[PDB]
Amino acid sequence: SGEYPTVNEIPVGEVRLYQIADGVWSHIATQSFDGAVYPSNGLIVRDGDELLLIDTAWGAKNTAALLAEIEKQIGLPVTRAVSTHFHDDRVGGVDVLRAAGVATYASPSTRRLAEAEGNEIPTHSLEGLSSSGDAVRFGPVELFYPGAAHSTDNLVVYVPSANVLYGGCAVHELSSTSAGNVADADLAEWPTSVERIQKHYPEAEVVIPGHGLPGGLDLLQHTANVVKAHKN
Ligand SMILES: COc1ncc(-c2c(C(=O)O)[nH]c3c([C@H](C)N4C[C@]5(C[C@@H](CN)C5)OC4=O)cccc23)cc1O
Numbered sequence: 001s002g003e004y005p006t007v008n009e010i011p012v013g014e015v016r017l018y019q020i021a022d023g024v025w026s027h028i029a030t031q032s033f034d035g036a037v038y039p040s041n042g043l044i045v046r047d048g049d050e051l052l053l054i055d056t057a058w059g060a061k062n063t064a065a066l067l068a069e070i071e072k073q074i075g076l077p078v079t080r081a082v083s084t085h086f087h088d089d090r091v092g093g094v095d096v097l098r099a100a101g102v103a104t105y106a107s108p109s110t111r112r113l114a115e116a117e118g119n120e121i122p123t124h125s126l127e128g129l130s131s132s133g134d135a136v137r138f139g140p141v142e143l144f145y146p147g148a149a150h151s152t153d154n155l156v157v158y159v160p161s162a163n164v165l166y167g168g169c170a171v172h173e174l175s176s177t178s179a180g181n182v183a184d185a186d187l188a189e190w191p192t193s194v195e196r197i198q199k200h201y202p203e204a205e206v207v208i209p210g211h212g213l214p215g216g217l218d219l220l221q222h223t224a225n226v227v228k229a230h231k232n
């Protein structure tokens with residue numbers, strides 16, 4: 001009824017939307033992995049009379065439910081999607097999107113890693129993001145490659161009209177103890193990558209993590225702290 005939804009409030013298979021700013025929503029879904037249930041976020045950004053989707057809802061059935069929730073709550077078509085790294089919480093559901101007419105995009109690095117791991121593969125490659133600090137425009141957002149962090153390919157997304165920074169899984173929520181699932185992470189480079197984000201987006205007003213509650217710019221410093229301490 002208004003606060004940001006949490007893992008035990010969303011059955012696996014349902015999707016919630018949360019209005020972040022004018023023309024900006026997050027999507028929240030839950031999924032089982034290795035016998036535990038986790039929430040995860042993505043983003044929806046209005047692009048005129050169309051929508052840009054950032055990240056799937058972590059699976060085919062969740063992503064079908066996402067599209068249905070968008071139709072119910074917003075009623076504009078999703079025409080493009082960007083996946084911010086290669087893991088299933090970001091690309092799982094790309095096949096559903098592709099068959100619903102959505103053009104799916106990711107960096108070449110994400111596409112190669114997704115293919116090598118057996119995850120679903122976005123159709124279109126996003127050039128211009130291969131060096132840390134690179135930024136490109138994509139409809140109503142800026143895509144930024146901060147360097148290796150949670151994964152080597154992780155992208156972040158800024159919505160300049162609303163000063164919304166979507167950090168994806170390179171950014172942790174404030175209740176995060178612990179650096180999340182670090183299987184593919186670069187703990188040594190992660191603080192440097194976060195510092196690049198902090199330098200590039202000093203006017204961010206909302207910061208959305210890949211999992212958990214949005215907050216302000218403090219999420220970035222918190223993430224650096226938790227990664228440094230996990231390493232320690
Ligand atoms: C305590 O809180 C939290 N705990 C954990 C997470 C969390 C994150 C995140 O840290 O982004 N990702 C998760 C994934 C994704 C799909 N996977 C799986 C994978 C293992 C590799 C294959 N061997 C690929 O690497 C990866 O990230 C699954 C399950 C949980 C998470 C988030 C939390 O908030």
Ligand SMILES: [Zn+2]
Nearest residue numbers: 085087150169
């Ligand atoms: Zn991940």
Ligand SMILES: [Zn+2]
Nearest residue numbers: 089169210211
């Ligand atoms: Zn994640």
